[PDB]
Amino acid sequence: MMELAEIDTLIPMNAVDGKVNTMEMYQIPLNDNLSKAPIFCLSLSPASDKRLSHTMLGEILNYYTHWTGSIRFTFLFCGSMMATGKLLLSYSPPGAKPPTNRKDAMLGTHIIWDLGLQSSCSMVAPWISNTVYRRCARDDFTEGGFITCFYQTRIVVPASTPTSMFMLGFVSACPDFSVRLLKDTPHISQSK
């Protein structure tokens, strides 16, 4: 099973109204305009989240009770070749004010991704914990942390180029990752 948790699977990040339960949820919005707002945010509750649950990582986790290990968040920019930009991906571990602006997110574990010929970039969330195992269920004790994204510069397109596009966000486990203690999944239901 842990072999399958190391496989990069697509996160329903943009599962907002009108986007939930259609292919459109996997597509993260990006554009030419310069904001100071988050592109996305994510609680590191990886089986008991709204988005991460029905990933292959989230699924395998929710047949188990306890987990340990580093999470790999891999992002693929799917704009035009001619679109440039620099982004910031962050993992802030928990217990402080959640990173609403870029200067807060910059003070944690972060990477500045330059968009270029290398289409994909990974941000690893290192295993930073008090407890040696965390819950797959949502916890106030074994808290996960906050994943965000910001613009470093802006995405810049030239003449005749698509001003708005997307990225794809994948999640996989790292080879430090392990689960323990079986249970039936809360995802599937059945008629009595």
Binding site: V16, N21, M25, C41, S43
Partner: peptide
């Protein structure tokens, strides 16, 4: 419909 409605893409 498996997935839950997210509030904003900026939901933590």
């Amino acid at each position: 419909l498996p997935l839950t409605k997210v509030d904003s893409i900026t939901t933590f």
